[PDB]
Amino acid sequence: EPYPAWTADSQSPVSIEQIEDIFIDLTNRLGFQRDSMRNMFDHFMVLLDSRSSRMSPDQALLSLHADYIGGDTANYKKWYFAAQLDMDDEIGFRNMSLDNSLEAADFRWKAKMNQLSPLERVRHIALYLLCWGEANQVRFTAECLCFIYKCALDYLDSPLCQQRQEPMPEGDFLNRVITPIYHFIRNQVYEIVDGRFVKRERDHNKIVGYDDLNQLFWYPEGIAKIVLEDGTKLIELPLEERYLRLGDVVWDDVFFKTYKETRTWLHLVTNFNRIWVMHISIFWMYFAYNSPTFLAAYKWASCALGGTVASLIQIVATLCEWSFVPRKWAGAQHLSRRFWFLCIIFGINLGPIIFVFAYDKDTVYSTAAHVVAAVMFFVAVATIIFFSIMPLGGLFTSYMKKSTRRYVASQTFTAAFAPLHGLDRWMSYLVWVTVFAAKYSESYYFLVLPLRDPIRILSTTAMRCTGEYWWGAVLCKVQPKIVLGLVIATDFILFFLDTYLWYIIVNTIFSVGKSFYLGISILTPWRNIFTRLPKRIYSKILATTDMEIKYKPKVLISQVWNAIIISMYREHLLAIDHVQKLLYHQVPSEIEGKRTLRAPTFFVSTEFFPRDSEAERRISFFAQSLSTPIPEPLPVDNMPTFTVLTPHYAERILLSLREIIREDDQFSRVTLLEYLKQLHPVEWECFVKDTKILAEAPEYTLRTRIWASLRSQTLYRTISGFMNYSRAIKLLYRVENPEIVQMFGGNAEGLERELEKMARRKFKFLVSMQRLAKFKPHELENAEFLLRAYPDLQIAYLDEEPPLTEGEEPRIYSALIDGHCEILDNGRRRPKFRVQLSGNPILGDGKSDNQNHALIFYRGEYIQLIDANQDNYLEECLKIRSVLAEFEELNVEQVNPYAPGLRYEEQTTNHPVAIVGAREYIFVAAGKEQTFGTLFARTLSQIGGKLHYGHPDFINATFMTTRGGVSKAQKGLHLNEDIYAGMNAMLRGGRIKHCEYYQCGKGEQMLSREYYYLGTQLPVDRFLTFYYAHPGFHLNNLFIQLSLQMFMLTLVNLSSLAHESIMCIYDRNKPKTDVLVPIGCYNFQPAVDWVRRYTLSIFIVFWIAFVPIVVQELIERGLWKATQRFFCHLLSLSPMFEVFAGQIYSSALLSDLAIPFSILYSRFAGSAIYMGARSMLMLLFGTVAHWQAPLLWFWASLSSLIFAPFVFNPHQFAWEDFFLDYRDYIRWLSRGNNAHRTNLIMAEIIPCAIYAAGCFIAFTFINAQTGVKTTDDDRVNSVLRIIICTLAPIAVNLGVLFFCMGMSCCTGSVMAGIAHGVAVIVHIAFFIVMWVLESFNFVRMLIGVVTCIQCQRLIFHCMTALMLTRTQPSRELTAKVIELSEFAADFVLGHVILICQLPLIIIPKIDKFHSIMLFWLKPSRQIRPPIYSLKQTRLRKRMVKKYCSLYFLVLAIFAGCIIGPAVASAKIHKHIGDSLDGVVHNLFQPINTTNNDTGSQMSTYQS
Ligand SMILES: OC[C@H]1O[C@@H](O[C@@H]2[C@@H](O)[C@H](O[C@@H]3[C@@H](O)[C@H](O[C@@H]4[C@@H](O)[C@H](O)O[C@H](CO)[C@H]4O)O[C@H](CO)[C@H]3O)O[C@H](CO)[C@H]2O)[C@H](O)[C@@H](O)[C@@H]1O
Ligand SMILES: CCCCCCCCCC(=O)O[C@H](COC(=O)CCCCCCC)COP(=O)(O)OCCN
Ligand SMILES: CCCCCCCCCCCCCC
Ligand SMILES: CCCCCCCCCCCC
Ligand SMILES: CCCCCCCCCCCC
Ligand SMILES: CCCCCCCCCCCC
Ligand SMILES: CCCCCCCCCC
Ligand SMILES: CCCCCCCCCC
Ligand SMILES: CCCCCCCCCC
């Protein structure tokens, strides 16, 4: 018997016979495929059965007609009111507010659909379904389908076609109006070569995709660009004669690009322009206030000048946005009409300032110069507030004239955000008001106020040196100012980290506080969740409130709790003597003889679960998750149907048999069977017990296959353990209604058949086996076994068939095979349906296409789309009637969507819910426990919303199918393949909520076109919430790294200034003896104290935003480790010990986010090492020149970043694997061998030149002698040293290369060997010559080496960029030179690293310790080869002993290169060399001069 909720009622308007005739009529008179008509007829009736199972059929049909075409929710009405009768701006106006006109048409539409007959509505819905089920891959472009549907309906509703009596040929709709569009889509890629298709290589800015292809149908002036074959526009023809000529149009003169994304940094200035306005514009005022050194009017005038900057960003953003949209495409006049209103505000804000600034000096105008400057400070505060609110894409729009288009993007498909009202609307303002209040309040007292003394000191004090030779002392006189500039600049980036710092705190405080105020899970009443289980199971899993005959509320709970436990036992998770204490036992009544129900001892108040196993983990969560409020479920006779999708490219259905044993000692450990036995050694015993009991053969082989496949990672386990929905639905049905059992008691087969029939009508499984036609003969047997095991599965695959005639592409179908179909002699089943596609439906590279070709067969109302590896245990598979109630449609009352009056302000179902994610974060003794809970909460709140925006689990099919698909992938767009659907269903109108009582079971997109639609149009609270989660987290990790390279550049300048000064001794209590006791000195102690207050605040932002993830990634073990650490540090150094222990976290994180030395070192060089060395030399110079106390907190961090990958290797430190690794390293080193274009050159040259000038300036000043009291004609001429020590090694390399080329002209291994040998030695010797030139002074030599390295790097980069921007011998010279120079660095830098491990090998036994530590870290299927005989042992010892001598000789050479000048610095006691006229005092003039010219001396000049 057929669909029983529509066909078996006496109130349905139309019968199935009158429904099938309509589907046959349209097929006959339009040419739809016969197998697609038979498919959509079943999909339309299943969808009408379920929705009519909880209401009346007369209302079910109306609700279906109001959700596909015609209601306020349907996408067709929204397209009709926006691209067929204009009226796009009147929709944006209404949304902002929350004869022609708008009501005069909305009322007409609403009163026209109200007088339709039930037999006339079916004809409307079927026409949409038949088009949607056949237009392949045009489903990604929703609007094309609406246009085609309108054309077809117009043709069918004209009286002319009625007289014609010959029907269109079959397969016409596909070969005539759908195939040209697909041919256009495919040809934008995949150029044809001689025989096949290959990926055409072209710039990713001339490739139109689906987003550009469907965007043409949003405007009436976009629809009017369709040109036919002959040349005329398509609008000329009448409405009725427009469908026939729809195959003549050429889709190549009609489609354009419409976004055209540019460079990356040009997008961030115009998308998030409300973050650069409320930070920079206030950082200006804060400093301009307390900086009098550049009266009282000038103070307010210079503070109010910060309203000009708050408008300059708003001008430079509109100017950048001018280069995204096309020229004349709708939404361009608004840019030009807004650029001329921004200039007026800029002019007004800059006007009176020019007056007040330069018209005040000692004239009679003080009366009218303070009033004009006090009002500008209040005008330039209105501008800052008005530009931090009021989205960029929507301001100055009320005042605009009619024009044509008022907005820049469509306000009905790009901006329809759900209002989010209720209580969250009020709790969303508070979170941001408090955050910004706290940030702006404490960022002024601890970051800007204590910086007003160094500003006054450093801006006035002047130096006295001799100076250089080409520019005298003009550069050494203004040093303090150069230091002050860098100090402010590096404190402008630390102003952006603070606001992300406060967002973490104020978002955890609210979560904890509200979860306490709601009283859910207060403290931890652990013996309460188990205490009251039955009352919760009787009201949250059974729908008894509408079942009546209230009787025996314990037998039902008994049945449910017995089944849930017996299943766990059957999975071999509990012992047989263990389940007896954990089950509802029934015992006969000794009083009379009747029956009695008992309860478990576990369950009223002893190894209840074995050693905190998976059984404990599951029964804990199941009982703990019923506390949270859960909506009341419906009876199992009224729940809607649903479906499960799963893709499959190439996975393993089963373990085979050769793969289970194989060979043992050729990989890790032994055979996989014994591996699994060792991993889980109790259920193997349960399995063998059951096998013996059954045996009380190949089938044993099959059972072993099954037992292995349920473990490891296959596709059979997902299907086997994910089909528990069927068992749950049968169990709930039989438990709920007992009368059905008694009517035919004694017929177990009949009862089973009834239950199966009911549970087969409410759950469908669908797996999309792509490329099933070309499986191997062994691989197809597993697929054939799946259908035999479960005779209700459904598979969809891509068939194929030879072309009709030679020369054309083959025709490929799309087929579905069930498990109840009859088998053929070929060994394959007859497909139930076969729909012809229009070509290879795979053009991308993701899984989107595979999900798309099989989305036709999705019968139901909701979809759970899963991955290829899921668990979904049975206990969490029982509350499926409650998670489907999040889609709040099950308990409502229908209100006849079409009705007179009731305008669109007082409706309720306006924003339906689209996606429903699942709960993804899986979890003084009392004080320690509370602190641990708070730390876990803080760790969760980091990803409480970060990874939870659009991760989809359930999908509203009706909503997310008529507009786009379930997910999209293309070469053009690139979001995440998984975050696109959730971020695109939010700005079409839908909502996104998520349940928290369900276990799931599991930048390059800054250039997207949806960040542009979101960050330019969202309201303020929503924009801040969106920004500080996805883009803000990625953009924060770039500021932390950028604010640690600006610090090393100011430390060098500020420590090269404290090394040549007297410093005016200063006490930090009350140093107001304003005589500056060393008399004549200049005090820099407050400036030097700034370093102490920066290291303190750069580690707070580290111990709150990077350490809490150690809990997440170390929750494996560490409770006992923490207990042991507390025991071993109960009376230790306390804070000092904790601080020193706060260094292993960086190493752990680095190694976790991170083996031969060659590969290990080459994988990290260029990302953490090449920067580490250059940032370590600078720190060494800084810590040698002045040695501030809080500077060794950087040494640990920089030393634990380049030593982490080399400490967590399995076997490295023993004695000889090290030397074999060294052998391999040496061999590899010997044979290693490694305005449209003005942005490429400046992308990587400007920051590499500023960083070089910053070091050159610091190097010149330390040589420029100060306080020396000499004559003018001394100077130092220190510039020439840099030129000598920079370009000379390049000259030597080039000369050697030329000489060796000539010698080859008149066995290249020796060539390379000698070249490398001289290249290393030249750099090592010119390291020494720079030390010699500075008269053997270490401190003023380190800064000479660093600047030489920087200048060489700059030269190489610029030369490479030039030689590739703009001759072949020149190329083969420059490339070789660059490689030969970089080889010396690659030979020195790593080789030093490998020397520092020398003292860590002399330990008599270290490998045992290291192995113990790494094994505690994790075991990984260990292995140890005992393959050792005399011959190779002798060879091993020979080679190991032979290379140790070279390893301890290179170390001696390096040590003798350093100790030499350190002992040769004593014998020499005079100046070295005397020259004149441009090289005078070339080496370094002073040998015994002093720089302490302080004391009673009253007036001296010493120029
Ligand atoms: O790229 C995608 C993935 O990015 C992952 O995050 C890493 C990010 O951690 C890395 O930044 C580090 C810096 O953190 C490090 O500076 C240290 C500070 O973090 C700390 O607070 O203070 C010490 C003081 O010594 C600093 O050294 O410096 C290194 C040096 O390069 C940076 O790498 O940057 C990576 C590339 O930008 C980035 O990938 C993220 O966790 C993943 O989720 C993401 O997929
Ligand atoms: C005194 C001895 C050393 C002489 C060093 C000669 C460098 C000669 C020039 C060069 O090689 O400079 C850089 C490499 O700098 C470095 O190794 C700096 C670290 C040096 C540590 C020395 C410790 C004693 C090239 O960097 P890249 O262009 O590779 O960076 C972009 C990514 N590819
Ligand atoms: C007003 C603030 C200006 C900030 C400019 C920052 C420039 C940084 C240049 C150096 C970056 C690191 C180069 C290795
Ligand atoms: C009743 C009006 C409430 C307005 C709330 C605005 C919140 C703005 C937060 C960010 C300010 C910079
Ligand atoms: C009159 C002397 C003015 C000197 C200004 C120096 C500014 C340095 C800015 C550095 C930014 C990275
Ligand atoms: C009036 C003298 C100006 C001297 C040149 C200053 C250049 C500053 C560049 C700073 C780079 C970090
Ligand atoms: C001050 C912010 C202006 C935009 C900064 C962009 C940083 C990333 C560039 C790649
Ligand atoms: C925008 C310039 C405003 C000039 C005001 C002058 C006032 C003069 C009062 C005597
Ligand atoms: C929420 C705190 C707002 C500012 C409180 C007062 C700060 C000090 C004013 C003197």
Ligand SMILES: CCCCCCCCCC
């Ligand atoms: C809400 C945090 C406010 C912090 C105020 C810091 C200054 C306290 C008074 C000096």
Ligand SMILES: CCCCCCCCCC
């Ligand atoms: C002169 C002070 C030196 C302090 C130690 C510098 C080297 C530290 C290596 C960890």
Ligand SMILES: CCCCCCCCCC
């Ligand atoms: C952990 C290493 C500590 C080194 C201290 C160096 C002190 C130098 C004082 C001049």
Ligand SMILES: CCCCCCCCC
């Ligand atoms: C001295 C600073 C006063 C306040 C500046 C404007 C703050 C706007 C939120």
Ligand SMILES: CCCCCCCCC
């Ligand atoms: C500082 C102003 C930059 C403006 C860039 C305009 C780019 C147009 C292609």
Ligand SMILES: CCCCCCCCC
């Ligand atoms: C003494 C009269 C001063 C009036 C100032 C008016 C300023 C208007 C912007």
Ligand SMILES: CCCCCCCCC
């Ligand atoms: C001399 C002090 C004048 C202060 C004027 C304040 C005006 C506020 C709108």
Ligand SMILES: CCCCCCCCC
């Ligand atoms: C001088 C103290 C200024 C404090 C400003 C607080 C602003 C809160 C929005």
Ligand SMILES: CCCCCCCCC
């Ligand atoms: C960036 C936050 C700095 C917080 C400093 C607090 C200092 C307390 C003594």
Ligand SMILES: CCCCCCCCC
């Ligand atoms: C203000 C944005 C541009 C900054 C200079 C160019 C940076 C290129 C990496």
Ligand SMILES: CCCCCCC
């Ligand atoms: C801090 C900006 C100063 C502007 C006035 C300079 C004369």
Ligand SMILES: CCCCCCC
């Ligand atoms: C534009 C800010 C400075 C004005 C100076 C006028 C002399």
Ligand SMILES: CCCCCCC
């Ligand atoms: C001196 C008071 C400091 C309070 C800090 C609160 C975060």
Ligand SMILES: CCCCCCC
């Ligand atoms: C005469 C000035 C020469 C400057 C050279 C800078 C590298």
Ligand SMILES: CCCCCCC
């Ligand atoms: C005194 C001139 C300005 C110095 C600071 C610029 C950031």
Ligand SMILES: CCCCCCC
């Ligand atoms: C905030 C400006 C950053 C410029 C340098 C980017 C590498």
